[PDB]
Design a protein around this ligand. Structure first.
Ligand SMILES: O=C(N[C@H](C(=O)O)c1ccc2c(c1)CCO2)c1ncnc2[nH]ccc12
Length: 164
């Protein structure tokens, strides 16, 4: 049900799209959220996905943290996808704006290998402060399962394709 994606490798595909609109159209088994360790979904991809769920993602996430404590940077958890997907895989990439180690970006993408197919953003890009060209290279060199990457910004999408 994914359509309009450019093939980068055997298993990695990319499109200039809003991940919320893509999730509402496709209703994938797994949508990846660019989470933080507290699952506080304020801005970027996380804020946008949570708003689309009418805040149900944040209510579920607060119950998960009250039971389990915070995630690790490079870690993940599987929660409901609400009206966007069967499941949401909340993955914590390092936030360079908060001083976190960029080497944890490969550990963050390894979480994707537990799922056959995923709709995802580029981890640690955008407001997390890492170079998106580096994030796409770590994705293609780490993930072995089928990943459909949605890049919201048109100008960044064009730069990622021409420099790949
Ligand atoms: O990475 C950028 N955008 C992506 C995207 O468009 O999907 C994006 C945006 C938000 C976000 C994530 C990724 C993951 C956490 O929230 C981006 N766009 C515009 N100017 C920029 N300068 C440096 C990077 C950058």
């Amino acid at each position: 049900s994914f359509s309009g994606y450019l093939k980068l490798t055997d298993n990695v595909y990319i499109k200039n799209a809003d991940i919320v609109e893509e999730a509402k159209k496709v209703k994938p088994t797994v949508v990846v959220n660019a989470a933080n360790v507290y699952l506080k979904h304020g801005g970027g991809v996380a804020g946008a996905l949570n708003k689309a769920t009418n805040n149900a993602m944040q209510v579920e996430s607060d119950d998960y943290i009250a039971t389990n404590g915070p995630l690790k940077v490079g870690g993940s958890c599987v929660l409901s996808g609400h009206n966007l997907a069967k499941h949401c895989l909340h993955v914590v990439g390092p936030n360079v704006n908060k001083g976190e180690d960029i080497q944890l970006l490969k550990s963050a993408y390894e979480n994707f290998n537990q799922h056959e197919v995923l709709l995802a953003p580029l981890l640690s890009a955008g407001i997390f402060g890492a170079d998106p060209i580096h994030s796409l290279r770590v994705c293609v060199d780490t993930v072995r399962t089928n990943v459909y990457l949605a890049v919201f910004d048109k100008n960044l999408y064009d730069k990622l394709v021409s420099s790949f």
